[PDB]
mmCIF file with all atom_site columns, C-alpha atoms in Angstrom:
data_model
loop_
_atom_site.group_PDB
_atom_site.id
_atom_site.type_symbol
_atom_site.label_atom_id
_atom_site.label_alt_id
_atom_site.label_comp_id
_atom_site.label_asym_id
_atom_site.label_entity_id
_atom_site.label_seq_id
_atom_site.pdbx_PDB_ins_code
_atom_site.Cartn_x
_atom_site.Cartn_y
_atom_site.Cartn_z
_atom_site.occupancy
_atom_site.B_iso_or_equiv
_atom_site.pdbx_formal_charge
_atom_site.auth_seq_id
_atom_site.auth_comp_id
_atom_site.auth_asym_id
_atom_site.auth_atom_id
_atom_site.pdbx_PDB_model_num
ATOM 1  C CA . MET A 1 1  ? 3.171   -3.021  -3.513  1.00 33.43 ? 4477 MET A CA 1
ATOM 2  C CA . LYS A 1 2  ? 4.021   -5.678  -6.221  1.00 33.12 ? 4478 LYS A CA 1
ATOM 3  C CA . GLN A 1 3  ? 0.285   -6.671  -6.310  1.00 31.12 ? 4479 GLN A CA 1
ATOM 4  C CA . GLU A 1 4  ? -1.027  -3.015  -6.360  1.00 33.89 ? 4480 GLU A CA 1
ATOM 5  C CA . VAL A 1 5  ? 1.028   -2.235  -9.566  1.00 35.08 ? 4481 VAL A CA 1
ATOM 6  C CA . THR A 1 6  ? 0.117   -5.521  -11.422 1.00 33.73 ? 4482 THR A CA 1
ATOM 7  C CA . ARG A 1 7  ? -3.643  -4.925  -10.689 1.00 33.58 ? 4483 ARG A CA 1
ATOM 8  C CA . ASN A 1 8  ? -3.293  -1.420  -12.285 1.00 28.82 ? 4484 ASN A CA 1
ATOM 9  C CA . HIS A 1 9  ? -1.453  -3.046  -15.305 1.00 28.66 ? 4485 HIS A CA 1
ATOM 10 C CA . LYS A 1 10 ? -4.120  -5.740  -16.208 1.00 28.24 ? 4486 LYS A CA 1
ATOM 11 C CA . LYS A 1 11 ? -5.869  -3.434  -18.778 1.00 26.09 ? 4487 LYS A CA 1
ATOM 12 C CA . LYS A 1 12 ? -2.499  -2.019  -20.073 1.00 26.80 ? 4488 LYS A CA 1
ATOM 13 C CA . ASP A 1 13 ? -0.773  -3.476  -23.207 1.00 25.78 ? 4489 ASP A CA 1
ATOM 14 C CA . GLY A 1 14 ? -0.254  -6.377  -25.493 1.00 30.01 ? 4493 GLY A CA 1
ATOM 15 C CA . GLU A 1 15 ? 0.783   -8.258  -22.272 1.00 29.28 ? 4494 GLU A CA 1
ATOM 16 C CA . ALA A 1 16 ? -1.311  -8.760  -19.053 1.00 30.74 ? 4495 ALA A CA 1
ATOM 17 C CA . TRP A 1 17 ? 0.961   -8.654  -15.919 1.00 34.02 ? 4496 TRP A CA 1
ATOM 18 C CA . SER A 1 18 ? 0.903   -11.655 -13.468 1.00 35.62 ? 4497 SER A CA 1
ATOM 19 C CA . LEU A 1 19 ? 2.759   -11.959 -10.081 1.00 33.78 ? 4498 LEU A CA 1
ATOM 20 C CA . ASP A 1 20 ? 4.341   -14.859 -11.966 1.00 32.21 ? 4499 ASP A CA 1
ATOM 21 C CA . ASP A 1 21 ? 6.856   -12.930 -14.185 1.00 32.28 ? 4500 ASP A CA 1
ATOM 22 C CA . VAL A 1 22 ? 7.085   -9.516  -12.404 1.00 32.11 ? 4501 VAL A CA 1
ATOM 23 C CA . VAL A 1 23 ? 10.225  -8.281  -10.509 1.00 35.34 ? 4502 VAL A CA 1
ATOM 24 C CA . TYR A 1 24 ? 11.099  -4.967  -8.701  1.00 33.85 ? 4503 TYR A CA 1
ATOM 25 C CA . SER A 1 25 ? 12.215  -1.766  -10.540 1.00 36.27 ? 4504 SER A CA 1
ATOM 26 C CA . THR A 1 26 ? 14.323  0.465   -8.200  1.00 36.85 ? 4505 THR A CA 1
ATOM 27 C CA . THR A 1 27 ? 15.705  4.041   -8.818  1.00 35.60 ? 4506 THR A CA 1
ATOM 28 C CA . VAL A 1 28 ? 17.252  6.602   -6.368  1.00 38.69 ? 4507 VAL A CA 1
ATOM 29 C CA . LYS A 1 29 ? 15.587  10.077  -6.356  1.00 39.69 ? 4508 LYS A CA 1
ATOM 30 C CA . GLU A 1 30 ? 18.944  12.047  -6.183  1.00 38.72 ? 4509 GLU A CA 1
ATOM 31 C CA . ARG A 1 31 ? 17.055  15.126  -4.790  1.00 35.46 ? 4510 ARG A CA 1
ATOM 32 C CA . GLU A 1 32 ? 18.742  17.949  -2.742  1.00 39.15 ? 4511 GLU A CA 1
ATOM 33 C CA . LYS A 1 33 ? 15.800  17.836  -0.209  1.00 39.01 ? 4512 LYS A CA 1
ATOM 34 C CA . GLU A 1 34 ? 13.406  15.002  0.902   1.00 39.21 ? 4513 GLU A CA 1
ATOM 35 C CA . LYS A 1 35 ? 10.576  17.658  1.249   1.00 41.00 ? 4514 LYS A CA 1
ATOM 36 C CA . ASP A 1 36 ? 10.690  18.434  -2.557  1.00 42.27 ? 4515 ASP A CA 1
ATOM 37 C CA . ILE A 1 37 ? 8.564   15.181  -2.687  1.00 45.53 ? 4516 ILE A CA 1
ATOM 38 C CA . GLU A 1 38 ? 5.025   16.696  -2.185  1.00 47.28 ? 4517 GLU A CA 1
ATOM 39 C CA . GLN A 1 39 ? 2.874   13.890  -3.824  1.00 46.13 ? 4518 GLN A CA 1
ATOM 40 C CA . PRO A 1 40 ? 3.396   10.066  -3.876  1.00 47.22 ? 4519 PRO A CA 1
ATOM 41 C CA . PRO A 1 41 ? 4.502   8.334   -7.124  1.00 46.57 ? 4520 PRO A CA 1
ATOM 42 C CA . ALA A 1 42 ? 2.000   6.966   -9.730  1.00 45.23 ? 4521 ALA A CA 1
ATOM 43 C CA . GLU A 1 43 ? 3.107   3.257   -9.492  1.00 42.82 ? 4522 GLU A CA 1
ATOM 44 C CA . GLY A 1 44 ? 5.648   3.524   -6.643  1.00 46.37 ? 4523 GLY A CA 1
ATOM 45 C CA . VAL A 1 45 ? 6.235   3.445   -2.859  1.00 42.05 ? 4524 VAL A CA 1
ATOM 46 C CA . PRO B 2 1  ? -2.146  3.203   23.874  1.00 38.12 ? 4333 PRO B CA 1
ATOM 47 C CA . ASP B 2 2  ? -3.227  -0.451  23.178  1.00 35.23 ? 4334 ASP B CA 1
ATOM 48 C CA . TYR B 2 3  ? -5.051  -0.843  19.772  1.00 35.60 ? 4335 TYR B CA 1
ATOM 49 C CA . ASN B 2 4  ? -8.704  -2.117  20.028  1.00 34.00 ? 4336 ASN B CA 1
ATOM 50 C CA . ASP B 2 5  ? -9.099  -4.888  17.352  1.00 31.97 ? 4337 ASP B CA 1
ATOM 51 C CA . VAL B 2 6  ? -12.840 -4.059  16.652  1.00 34.20 ? 4338 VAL B CA 1
ATOM 52 C CA . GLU B 2 7  ? -11.887 -0.295  16.342  1.00 34.64 ? 4339 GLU B CA 1
ATOM 53 C CA . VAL B 2 8  ? -8.808  -0.989  14.065  1.00 33.20 ? 4340 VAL B CA 1
ATOM 54 C CA . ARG B 2 9  ? -11.010 -3.062  11.640  1.00 33.02 ? 4341 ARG B CA 1
ATOM 55 C CA . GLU B 2 10 ? -13.438 -0.028  11.413  1.00 36.02 ? 4342 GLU B CA 1
ATOM 56 C CA . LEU B 2 11 ? -10.426 2.319   10.670  1.00 33.72 ? 4343 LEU B CA 1
ATOM 57 C CA . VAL B 2 12 ? -9.034  -0.260  8.118   1.00 35.29 ? 4344 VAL B CA 1
ATOM 58 C CA . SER B 2 13 ? -12.443 -0.498  6.271   1.00 35.31 ? 4345 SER B CA 1
ATOM 59 C CA . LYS B 2 14 ? -12.160 3.329   5.644   1.00 34.96 ? 4346 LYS B CA 1
ATOM 60 C CA . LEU B 2 15 ? -8.595  3.094   4.055   1.00 36.46 ? 4347 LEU B CA 1
ATOM 61 C CA . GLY B 2 16 ? -8.427  3.858   0.277   1.00 38.53 ? 4348 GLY B CA 1
ATOM 62 C CA . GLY B 2 17 ? -6.185  2.216   -2.374  1.00 37.49 ? 4349 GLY B CA 1
ATOM 63 C CA . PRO B 2 18 ? -3.112  3.323   -4.403  1.00 42.44 ? 4350 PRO B CA 1
ATOM 64 C CA . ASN B 2 19 ? -4.023  6.098   -6.939  1.00 41.99 ? 4351 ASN B CA 1
ATOM 65 C CA . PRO B 2 20 ? -6.930  6.893   -4.540  1.00 41.62 ? 4352 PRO B CA 1
ATOM 66 C CA . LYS B 2 21 ? -8.644  9.549   -6.802  1.00 37.81 ? 4353 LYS B CA 1
ATOM 67 C CA . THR B 2 22 ? -9.687  7.146   -9.680  1.00 38.91 ? 4354 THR B CA 1
ATOM 68 C CA . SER B 2 23 ? -9.285  3.720   -7.864  1.00 39.07 ? 4355 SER B CA 1
ATOM 69 C CA . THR B 2 24 ? -12.669 3.851   -5.936  1.00 38.77 ? 4356 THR B CA 1
ATOM 70 C CA . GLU B 2 25 ? -11.612 0.685   -3.929  1.00 37.11 ? 4357 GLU B CA 1
ATOM 71 C CA . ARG B 2 26 ? -11.391 0.506   -0.064  1.00 36.77 ? 4358 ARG B CA 1
ATOM 72 C CA . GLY B 2 27 ? -10.903 -1.839  2.935   1.00 38.05 ? 4359 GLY B CA 1
ATOM 73 C CA . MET B 2 28 ? -9.104  -5.184  3.606   1.00 39.82 ? 4360 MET B CA 1
ATOM 74 C CA . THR B 2 29 ? -9.465  -6.246  -0.131  1.00 41.41 ? 4361 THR B CA 1
ATOM 75 C CA . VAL B 2 30 ? -6.578  -3.795  -1.068  1.00 39.70 ? 4362 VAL B CA 1
ATOM 76 C CA . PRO B 2 31 ? -3.134  -5.554  -0.864  1.00 42.63 ? 4363 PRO B CA 1
ATOM 77 C CA . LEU B 2 32 ? -1.427  -2.897  1.403   1.00 41.29 ? 4364 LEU B CA 1
ATOM 78 C CA . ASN B 2 33 ? -4.554  -2.385  3.645   1.00 42.15 ? 4365 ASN B CA 1
ATOM 79 C CA . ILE B 2 34 ? -4.557  -6.175  4.467   1.00 44.72 ? 4366 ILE B CA 1
ATOM 80 C CA . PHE B 2 35 ? -0.767  -5.751  5.109   1.00 47.10 ? 4367 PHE B CA 1
ATOM 81 C CA . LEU B 2 36 ? -1.298  -2.684  7.393   1.00 46.95 ? 4368 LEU B CA 1
ATOM 82 C CA . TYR B 2 37 ? -3.994  -4.617  9.379   1.00 47.43 ? 4369 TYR B CA 1
ATOM 83 C CA . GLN B 2 38 ? -1.526  -7.573  9.774   1.00 48.62 ? 4370 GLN B CA 1
ATOM 84 C CA . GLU B 2 39 ? 1.371   -5.366  11.095  1.00 51.10 ? 4371 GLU B CA 1
ATOM 85 C CA . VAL B 2 40 ? -0.933  -3.208  13.364  1.00 51.50 ? 4372 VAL B CA 1
ATOM 86 C CA . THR B 2 41 ? -2.186  -6.515  14.948  1.00 51.74 ? 4373 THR B CA 1
ATOM 87 C CA . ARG B 2 42 ? 1.521   -7.653  15.209  1.00 51.06 ? 4374 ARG B CA 1
ATOM 88 C CA . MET B 2 43 ? 2.445   -4.244  16.799  1.00 47.45 ? 4375 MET B CA 1
ATOM 89 C CA . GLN B 2 44 ? -0.401  -4.503  19.405  1.00 44.51 ? 4376 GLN B CA 1
ATOM 90 C CA . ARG B 2 45 ? 0.866   -8.072  20.161  1.00 44.61 ? 4377 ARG B CA 1
ATOM 91 C CA . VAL B 2 46 ? 4.323   -6.498  20.955  1.00 47.52 ? 4378 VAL B CA 1
ATOM 92 C CA . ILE B 2 47 ? 2.946   -3.407  22.875  1.00 45.66 ? 4379 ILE B CA 1
ATOM 93 C CA . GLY B 2 48 ? 0.817   -5.819  25.015  1.00 45.37 ? 4380 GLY B CA 1
#
């Protein structure tokens, strides 16, 4: 997953993302149901 | 049922990438599709 996101963020800027100098960003969905999630995230798992 | 290695590789070659609408990339070259192939081959090794 860490590769997949950094390959998307090579064009983005500014700064070009390497696997050197990237770390995980983690948030908890806090949703009443798990089936409210219909599509995957943009950059996520 | 036991996974056929030559079949699995044909199913893996068909796998898309993340953001699969605009990505237009497929197969073992995609970081999670190489990973899937590795853990499917490790799962068959266990099943066997």
